[PDB]
Design a protein around this nucleic acid. Structure first.
Ligand SMILES: *O[C@H]1CCO[C@@H]1COP(=O)(O)O
Length: 297
DNA sequence: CGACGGATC
DNA sequence: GCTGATGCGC
DNA sequence: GATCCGTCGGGCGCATCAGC
């Protein structure tokens, strides 16, 4: 009730399944002398909105969880609004990279804020440049790549399901795999798919809802996992029900009636270096909550 | 997106 | 130029 | 017993506009 995630919420669960509790299921902090990267990812549902929330201060988050790189989705920013925010950004993180939808305005929008100068930063899939909907940001680091994405929602009526499955999902795969040729890859963001029924509260009701269509779930396996990539949370907390998105319509958060739509998918070659893929259901301000990764470098 | 029939499988 | 209302995808 | 379909309906951030 003050921690409603700790309660298991599911329409057709299984007895083995236990609800994720970060305070008990998270490994202890890593040893002092460990080359680690700590990333965080959050679909803020409007960056401007979020900065104007209860008492939100990015600085607090970066103090609370001491993240090295922050990945944001659905900034809802225009390329005009970037310079202002880029200053107000978390102080101490001065290398920030932003991508905004230029078509539908105040929609979509990705961003990577880091205190580690990347070796390079490119937007969109390949040298095609910024995605029109500002949905892809890719950053090269010394040992790996980090792709932040806000996958296009197939929409109500699934009127974008064909674009999603036949175009987006494919190109995102091809982008990732081309990169893996050189350095390993870490994909994160709002992938907009609950892979399994453990990743959703009402699997049956949402069989034709965007996010849980068999088509989208197959593509997740086919275009991504079955092509060399690992769901960091799922490998670490098998049979644990943790959600990353709760709707506003019915206060799903107060009832943990949630989906898991945000991931940290990593290449197999690096899956052992994963220390903790986690979820922070406590941090409000968005219909999504933050998720984090601690990767031994 | 959850939740609710009634009709359908 | 400012606000409440509207519209639309999430 | 389940799935299906058709419906509602105290949601939200942002852009745009009417009407001051
Ligand atoms: O219906 C919800 C759950 C699956 O997709 C929408 C959420 O959209 P995102 O904010 O995840 O794009």
């Amino acid at each position: 009730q003050s921690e409603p995630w700790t309660v298991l919420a599911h329409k057709k669960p299984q007895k083995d399944w236990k609800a994720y509790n970060p305070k008990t299921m998270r490994p202890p902090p890593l040893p002092e002398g460990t080359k680690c990267v700590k990333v965080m990812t959050w679909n803020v549902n409007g960056l401007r909105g979020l900065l104007k929330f209860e008492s939100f201060s990015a600085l607090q988050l970066a103090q609370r969880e001491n993240f090295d790189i922050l990945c944001l989705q659905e900034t809802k920013l225009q390329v005009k609004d970037v310079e202002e925010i880029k200053k107000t950004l978390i102080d101490g993180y001065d290398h920030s990279f932003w991508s905004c939808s230029v078509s539908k305005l105040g929609y979509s929008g990705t961003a990577i804020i880091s205190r580690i100068k990347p070796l390079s930063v490119r937007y969109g899939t390949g040298l095609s440049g910024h995605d029109t909907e500002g949905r892809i940001v890719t950053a090269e680091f010394d040992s790996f790549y980090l792709i932040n994405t806000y996958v296009p929602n197939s929409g109500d009526g699934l009127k974008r399901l064909s674009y999603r499955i036949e175009e987006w999902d494919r190109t995102l795969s091809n982008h990732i795999k081309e990169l893996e040729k050189s350095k390993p890859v870490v994909l994160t963001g709002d992938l907009n798919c609950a892979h399994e029924e453990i990743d959703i509260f009402n699997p049956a009701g949402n069989k034709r809802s965007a996010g849980f269509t068999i088509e989208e779930r197959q593509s997740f396996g086919a275009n991504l996992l079955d092509k060399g990539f690992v769901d960091t949370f799922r490998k670490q907390h098998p049979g644990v029900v943790g959600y990353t998105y709760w709707g506003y319509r019915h206060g799903g958060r107060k009832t943990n009636k949630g989906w898991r739509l945000d991931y940290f998918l990593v290449s197999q070659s690096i899956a052992a270096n994963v220390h903790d893929s986690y979820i922070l259901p406590d941090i409000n301000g968005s219909d999504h909550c933050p998720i984090g990764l601690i990767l031994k470098l």
